[PDB]
């Protein structure tokens, strides 16, 4: 056995299944969708007392931003690809990239890696969070599958966040962004958080104003 | 190991070739192709919500030429598309339609190259080929997953093979469209069905009419 170029007698591919056994080591990240806004928090793991923790969040385009949670190198490669692709898009058509066209494209890249034997499947799964008009959250399993979402949490002990998601409607209190973000920080619980929707595009409130916002879960 | 790949035995005899022939010989779609005096018949059993109206083994690859095929079906549609490609390239290059054996050089060689070259699997399909030759004599050839331009006054393919050679011999002692087609439809009965002659228009290759299926079967 031992290559993704062949199926198991069960009918399963093991190699691609191992990608989730990669992703579980990664730190949890969570996302919430207000009707006109999307908020995506991460969790920046700190390797040492003197390390500054890495940022899970990125910013592929004006209103598009992402939060990969798997092995970092594949993640950065997907970012460089998705960015080069959005820019190719605008450069061709004097127009912002369709979000779903992008998701469909990156997912095409995953499958192109997870089908061919010589290229290993990615050990990462993006959680895209954006809109070309109305707010969206896509997830890409380390394969050609991708799903739209209302709310998504993934990585390490994301299990707490998952079971917690049921406790709130994704938009049980959509109307205020502060309600939204407080749902985000509850759902997840330096650590990162980022905001995108309506007038302001993608944004990363990692400011000390965020540090002020942190006490609000306990305020 | 030698069996896992298209290579010689310690005894000097190839393996995987025999296995592909088991693919054909366990395909269980028997087909009798007998030449007729100044004509030639090619018959096969056509074997839910499935359509018998769709199903066939017989297929034309030019007006003058038709090749029943048996084996792994995808390989069959592929070897047919290859056959049509072949006649089109020969006609395009030379302005003559291929003699049936000339189409068997392409069929048998393309089917051969798989045998040496270890990668791409050996061909899993086989079948007759019929067509009026430049010589007015009708020409009936065959091929094997192991390369073979063969050559016959009569032939059988599928789950039944040389089992029905001795059976065919009895018709061979009695071997016009009446006289020849009955040999074929009987040869299915001897060991609905679909019959195909080149001699409708004496050069054009067409499967015999549906209304006229029964009259031989009932005569």
């Amino acid at each position: 056995d031992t290559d993704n170029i062949i199926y198991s007698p069960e009918g399963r591919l093991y190699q691609v299944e191992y990608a989730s056994e990669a992703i579980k080591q990664g730190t949890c990240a969570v996302a919430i969708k207000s009707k006109d806004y999307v908020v995506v928090s991460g969790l920046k793991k700190c390797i040492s007392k003197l390390s500054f923790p890495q940022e899970k969040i990125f910013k592929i385009d004006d209103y598009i931003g992402i939060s990969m949670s798997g092995i970092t190198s594949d993640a950065k490669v997907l970012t460089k690809f998705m960015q080069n692709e959005c820019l190719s898009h605008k450069f061709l058509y004097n127009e912002n990239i369709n979000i779903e066209s992008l998701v469909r494209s990156v997912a095409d890249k995953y499958q192109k890696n997870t089908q061919k034997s010589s290229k290993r499947a990615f050990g990462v799964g993006l959680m895209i969070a954006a809109y070309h008009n109305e707010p969206c959250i896509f997830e890409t399993r380390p394969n050609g599958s991708y799903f739209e979402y209302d709310a998504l949490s993934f990585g390490a002990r994301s299990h707490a966040s998952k079971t917690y998601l049921e406790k709130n409607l994704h938009l049980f209190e959509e109307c205020s962004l502060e309600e939204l973000i407080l749902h985000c920080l509850k759902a997840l619980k330096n650590t990162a958080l980022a905001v995108v929707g309506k007038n302001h595009p993608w944004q990363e409130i990692s400011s000390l104003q965020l540090e002020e916002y942190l006490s609000k879960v306990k305020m | 190991y030698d069996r896992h790949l298209t290579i010689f035995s310690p005894d000097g005899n190839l393996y995987q070739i025999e296995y592909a022939i088991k693919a054909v010989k366990n395909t269980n779609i028997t087909s009798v192709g007998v030449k007729g005096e100044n004509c030639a018949v090619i018959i096969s059993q056509k074997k839910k919500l499935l359509d018998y109206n769709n199903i066939t083994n017989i297929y034309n690859i030019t007006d003058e030429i038709g090749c029943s095929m048996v084996g792994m079906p995808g390989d069959c549609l592929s070897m047919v598309y290859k056959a049509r490609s072949e006649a089109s390239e020969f006609l395009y290059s030379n302005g003559y339609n291929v003699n049936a054996e000339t189409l068997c050089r392409n069929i048998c060689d393309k089917i051969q190259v798989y045998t040496q070259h270890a990668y791409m699997r050996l061909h899993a399909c086989s079948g007759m080929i019929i067509g009026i030759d430049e010589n007015n004599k009708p020409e009936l050839f065959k091929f094997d997953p192991s390369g073979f331009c063969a050559g016959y006054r009569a032939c059988v393919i599928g789950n039944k093979e040389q089992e029905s050679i001795s059976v065919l011999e009895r018709l061979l002692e009695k071997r016009d469209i009446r006289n020849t087609t009955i040999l074929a439809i009987e040869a299915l009965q001897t060991i609905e069905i679909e019959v195909a002659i080149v001699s409708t228009k004496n050069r054009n290759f067409t499967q015999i009419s549906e209304k006229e299926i029964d009259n031989y079967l009932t005569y």
Binding site: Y14, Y18, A19, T72, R120, A121 | -
Partner: protein, 217 residues
Amino acid sequence: VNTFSPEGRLFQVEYALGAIKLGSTAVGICVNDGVILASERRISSTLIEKDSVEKLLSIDDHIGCAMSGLMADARTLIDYARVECNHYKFIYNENINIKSCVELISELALDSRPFGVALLIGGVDKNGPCLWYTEPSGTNTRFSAASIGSAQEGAELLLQENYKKDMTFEQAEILALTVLRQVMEDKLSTSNVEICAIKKSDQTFYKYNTDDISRII
């Protein structure tokens, strides 16, 4: 190569970790006034031309990069990094921001065989010195203070013992000389170290003259 382990870690690249443990140690410390960069120079055989072999290098004029693990794979990554982080400045004067030089080297380091080396690239580009360790795994990270080599296993604690942001680069030099002299067998001399620095002002990469390190000790 890239046959994912059932455990979920990549096999190969996780086998390749140990190569840095073969590394002789080096301690880079970003500081408010620069980046200090020390390493073992006692690696030397008695008869190799004395102190004629540098662990610490210079990717660009204002970048300096101590290396772990195999000397060869490091020589390659430094070669391509010199090429690229120079090629960045092809007509416009600005040299590549350290974070992005290092981002190049890592983004290549991802994808033969995985490199057996880790780097400790430092430099001043933004108003403030940068200190970037590159793991062989392609993971890229900005320490304030950090060490490489197998001696970094326990020597790292020593940084935690002393690292305050607020130091004259000279104070930082004392500090890194502390932590690195501790792990050496020989009493430290200029033959035991190959220290280099990039100032917050001078921003120029400069290996210390032996007279200097002989003076501080």
